[PDB]
Design a binder for this molecule. Sequence first.
Ligand SMILES: [Cl-]
Ligand SMILES: [Cl-]
Lengths: 164, 165
Amino acid sequence: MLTYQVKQGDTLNSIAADFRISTAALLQANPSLQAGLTAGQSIVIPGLPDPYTIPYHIAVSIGAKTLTLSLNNRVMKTYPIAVGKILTQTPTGEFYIINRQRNPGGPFGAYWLSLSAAHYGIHGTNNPASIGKAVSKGCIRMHNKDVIELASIVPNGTRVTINR
Amino acid sequence: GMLTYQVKQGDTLNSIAADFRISTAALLQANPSLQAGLTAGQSIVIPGLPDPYTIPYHIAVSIGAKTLTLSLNNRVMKTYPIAVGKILTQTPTGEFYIINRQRNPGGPFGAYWLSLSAAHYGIHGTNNPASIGKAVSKGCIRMHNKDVIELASIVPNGTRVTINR
Ligand SMILES: [Cl-]
Ligand SMILES: [Cl-]
């Protein structure tokens, strides 16, 4: 099961928001939390497949404006993306796909895939000219046809590694 | 004066820069000591903004009440209905500041966007007035367009925004 290391400053609700779960679910999965939330301790995040057995991996290059989908550490597809503006960048680091919603429409296009950072995700677009540019509030945007392909394949729990 | 931020473990130059909508160059320039490392608990300067404690306005947001209250010199002057984040994508709680603003961004953001000191979060208008008063957003605070215009025309960047469950 997916684990998370508690950081100084974390709260039950800040963690819940990153992982798109209720505090009820968070507490149910972690009886230890009754004793208090303490930095350095590990907790389990409910609602996800075991990420260790997921053969898919997503790698994002902010600099190259590309997203690669790999299966068994070999590349299946490569897509161009939009990324965050220079003052509102897409964050670098290690994330997970948490959930997805079909056809959110509007600026989100054909799919929204939640990333394990509050408010961040991978989604479609109503604005094709934005793809390939640093123009977003921080999300990764793809052409609708591409995010549909991506969502149709990858399970929740899939790792998303974002690099410069 | 200058606004200050207290570093927490896990913070990076980039994460802080994203929260305060500044470049890492600006952050570093204002804090020459950071090159030697970030330590939890240290206070750093955030350029481009005044001392928030010099601004006489204070905004209080209640997620429960679905209200944003504006105070001046610790007197309540106006209260507005707001939309807040859905249960799985809640509005974050704590102490924030208004960081910058953009007039008439349009789309779901309506007549105004005010950035809050958490990356991707802000107070903004809406092209969906029915949503105001409900827990329906990805995490932002939404107001009626006329309300966010009014709020934005009163309060300056750096204004303290306290968000309570
Ligand atoms: Cl968004
Ligand atoms: Cl937004």
